[PDB]
């Protein structure tokens, strides 16, 4: 039971474990695409001796955090342990080795999407974005008198406007916390999935505005449901225009989208209740690799006045943290801690999705100063609400 | 088609329209209870000539708003138009007359629970609290190592500990935005509903801590589901202790509760995803009757520095609004408006449930200054998350 | 295994078999009511020796047939064979004896409601009315510009307007084919079922017009469904007014009614499709006891010119049938048959629910003359569409 | 926003809007087929400037009406407005232009199948046929002793007997109201849909009689349900023989068919209730383009004696209407109207699906003479029950 970087001879064993572990799994054509994102020592395998019984890798990503700051981010993916080798510590050993390599390589953060919610907390990952599904009964939906755009939107084939989607998405990712650079190879895959599959998904159409797009398709089994796979809007006007067009899908009963908790959609309608929350789940998980580099890198709210505290991360260091004029300075200290929390809690607070006070109520964040808690809450808040870019 | 205060002879016609309009409706024994809360000129009826075809009333309530400030609040309830008299403007005429009486009586706010989401916006009511149902698959739930109370909780009969529930609830309502004084007569009704009904609900039990209680019952049809009707916890320790006891209902598969978006429950567990959001809806709706009295009455966040603006409410006045040291001064002005919004939008922002930026994205709040928007957001935020007291 | 009229000592054994055979079965309080309708020799029981293993009876009823003619009608009911005595010919023997008594007593027709569709055909009964359930999605329902009554309807308690329902129902039954006289004791039972039952049905309300009424209640399990138990309208204006009021049940999603195929409801709306047919079944079954007395008694369409034919009923006689000026003369003959059909087919054609041509296509009605078939079709048609009065 | 006949360059924009608007939509291979049926100026498009945002066309069809008379019929199809251009009057403008062209071209009637029931009434279209789904629990089905054919039916592959289906269908359409000529290109499409699709429908089989055929297939998800796509029988013997064979599908639990209200199937069985009505909906919609040409063209019932009246169609002319010996003469007059109705009501009465009395009860047809109403009812009735040919 040895742990190594894979050789070319290991990859067929990895694709076998992939097919058996992941239901989304196409086959080794999307492998050319995603492999480019994996750097030279970005993968580990466990062999028994001798076949592949475990694998994990990271991709080179670019993540937007509050203040429109873009961090090099190690994106863990393709994580699998053979069903024959459970409870042997393989996941723990693979995560320890990748974290060592990520830290040494100079990444301030790592990120992942979690197949289950109980695994990655113990490895320092905290849920950092929230997926919010809205289902609109569009037969009753009337726009409020105040709603913009009372058309600049066109109904188009996705494949014929790749360049415009690419340009709108690039503008969106730079300005929104949670934003990820989407490389050419993931656009190739997005348009692949957008064409009809025999006994699979129906054709996708696009609604295209100068400052936004929506990709949608009719559900396989339900022909009265349109699923919005993705809506990226750089302006409020674009967002409202796109929703006017989606509510115009007159043959549909329901429009569903996976969005964020602060989606203004409900406020565009005379009946806010028509935008029903049908599902909520953790999106992106963050592990802060380097506490001072992460805390210094992001912007903080300008509204809160300068304050100083001492933050301890459990087995992650203790730091003099000074926050003012929307900037943090974060320096080593042995002075007494005023705030203690595990590494995962800091990742949950990093993009502004979770309030420090809510975590403090659960005892995940500990302080004897309620004023410092209100100050953390306000400082770590995000002006621009955090969204989920794409699963990886 | 005349609109008057009811006489004693009108009340049987009102109870008939009630039975036909409301499915929750017991009969005129809960009528003795709720009638005490209705002040002398707190009810209107519409007669055709000549039976009752429309009715509406308000109750005298006490609502906690941010800063632990308690406002006299007019609670609209028992609103009904006969199915024979729809589209005759009866609701509009009844609301106009009650609002006139409420304003003249000196109430700064009115409140209601909405049977549908598309009605009350046009009468100046904005949804001000959010109901969030969590369903816990308690068979998988393990408490986090950080969770307090790793018992001070007793399993009791509700009827034998009325006094302790009353005392814990009183402490909770005073310290939480959304809190309502619960009068003796609504405690009488709560314990009535807590006893088993033949072909109705199962018996309710209570979990009692010095600083919290939960009322729960097994579902009628589903014997593996326990429904928490109400959990009031004054301390984090009480909340965690009560949830340790609810997760100990070993014969149940699922625990469901209607709570608020900031309920720390998910953070108490090793798998946050086990606390699934199964339902979200508007709770309390607010109509600000007097803008300056409401805006001056509540506390604002101390973290945001002193600022000055001009707020216009559409057909509600224009005001010089100065906010600093957590207090607002709100005075008449004819100076140019920097912020415009309808009366309903102000009610939605009053308890801190909705961000000004989210409403601005929908064009419900209008400003040409993004800095003023961040300042409104931070100032109107609530340190203590807003909760829903009880339906009326 | 003897077949007799019951004695007083037989009735407890009959109520036992009733409880075990019928799920609708209240107990012997509705027995006082229905027993009055049973004439002196109107019941048979089968004893084994020695308990009751079979029973059947008829009631004295008054049935409206085309031409507003009212026939004495023997209504079979309370028919049951013990589960211990199936396949012993008990039903056949009980039906043969009751038919002998009914024929000898001078009834021209017998009638029943069938628990299953495959039993009573072989005893000469044909389905004669059609139950048609409409479910209206009332949230989309808009009345057509042409619809009358663009209120004369009141929302009332059934128990307080018994006399007005009685008077409207009496007018309806006399003018509609399928109409039955409803005696005092069946009004007693109707109002019993109209009050709320603990763990049973919700309270019933009434919509009362000078020329019509609807009884409705909210469904037990579904609180968004109102079930119309009964709507009797003497004029088109009443029918439309009552439906305007039912569509005003704003808290309901759906209104369901068991009506007839020619209910004009769909034509009152801008979208006829909103009145969905959710269920269709046979209502009243007729056995013609005396062919000449039945055929002479009813009115025929005045539009068809005088014609003469020879009708044979299989083991029921052969008759010279002359139809003109809406009257039939029906006299014995040994001349060659031009039309043959079983007794059940004549019952199906008697109230105009089933066309002769449709039965001829199935070979239930046989003729070598297609002109005679068109003539039968037109003559047996009913100006006033046939409806179902009440189950017995 | 201009409205024109499409050019070749418009057709790709039309196929895009088609794919997005219609879920049945194969792609531009069925386009070669259906395009032949579209005459030279039979299509309109709306451009924004500049892409296609709206389209509509008609096909040249041949519709059988009562009296076995075949009318040139303009069949509206491929009607779509882009979801970006709702509420701009595009449908109204496209329908006005096509109606102008259809009227000028000399079509007495237009027809369509409606995606929703609330659209086409306001454009003069009335539902003229009724779709009736029967589901037979074939495990209980026994044929009545009177049922013909107590085999002349063969189980065959559709593709190998195209010529025999074509010949049987041609005989059926000529003799049945609702019948449409089915051109070569729609037979090409029918056999395309009859072969198994990977992840789509199962193979179709045929039951072939000299005077009838049934096409059926096992349902995708339900393997105990056989769906009859089409059953055309020229004789009663063929219809019964085909149903004997379908009831012989011993591996099936249920047989479902979309048929008409007068399908004799239920009468072929000992238990009529086994043929359950699971669904009812409008089939073909008719707009009478020229009232006198339509009313003169069809046959009327010979049973009703000669009568004369004055019919007004709202904005459609007033006419002296004389009906006798199954023929109508329909001439201009300014004499007082005895009957008024909108154009849509006449289309609903044209094929005999809807009675004048039922429409009169809804006030869609207005007269002060009840005798004239009985006369209209009998005269417009159809000897041969109206059926639905095929969707377009
Ligand atoms: O589809 C993504 C993916 C696929 C494949 C493929 F199966 F095509 F070879 N290879 C991936 C790789 C690769 F193995 F390095 F190529 C890295 C990251 C994601 C990959 C994964 C699959 C499961 C978990 C989330 N996305
Ligand atoms: O149960 C509450 C209530 C009941 C009754 C009763 F039906 F017992 F006479 N009366 C109420 C009254 C009363 F009519 F003034 F007594 C006011 C407010 C709420 C009442 C309402 C009923 C429906 C809407 C929300 N709570
Ligand atoms: O409720 C009707 C009914 C009830 C009862 C009762 F159970 F109350 F004694 N007795 C009935 C009688 C009676 F037995 F003669 F009293 C006749 C007809 C219907 C009766 C029946 C019961 C099942 C079949 C249709 N209606
Ligand atoms: O399938 C029928 C149809 C298809 C197509 C196709 F998409 F193949 F090019 N073209 C049609 C045309 C055509 F566009 F003129 F070719 C006319 C009428 C029906 C057509 C339509 C499609 C939706 C509404 C009812 N039948």
Short mmCIF file of C-alpha atoms in Angstrom, two decimals, chain A residues 300-302 304-306 323-328:
data_model
loop_
_atom_site.label_atom_id
_atom_site.label_comp_id
_atom_site.label_asym_id
_atom_site.label_seq_id
_atom_site.Cartn_x
_atom_site.Cartn_y
_atom_site.Cartn_z
CA UNK A 300 -12.74 43.99 4.26
CA UNK A 301 -15.80 46.29 4.70
CA UNK A 302 -14.79 50.04 4.87
CA UNK A 304 -16.22 49.15 10.33
CA UNK A 305 -13.59 51.34 12.06
CA UNK A 306 -10.01 50.16 12.63
CA UNK A 323 -8.22 45.54 10.06
CA UNK A 324 -8.84 49.12 8.84
CA UNK A 325 -9.60 51.05 5.59
CA UNK A 326 -10.74 47.67 4.17
CA UNK A 327 -7.20 46.10 4.53
CA UNK A 328 -5.82 43.52 7.03
#
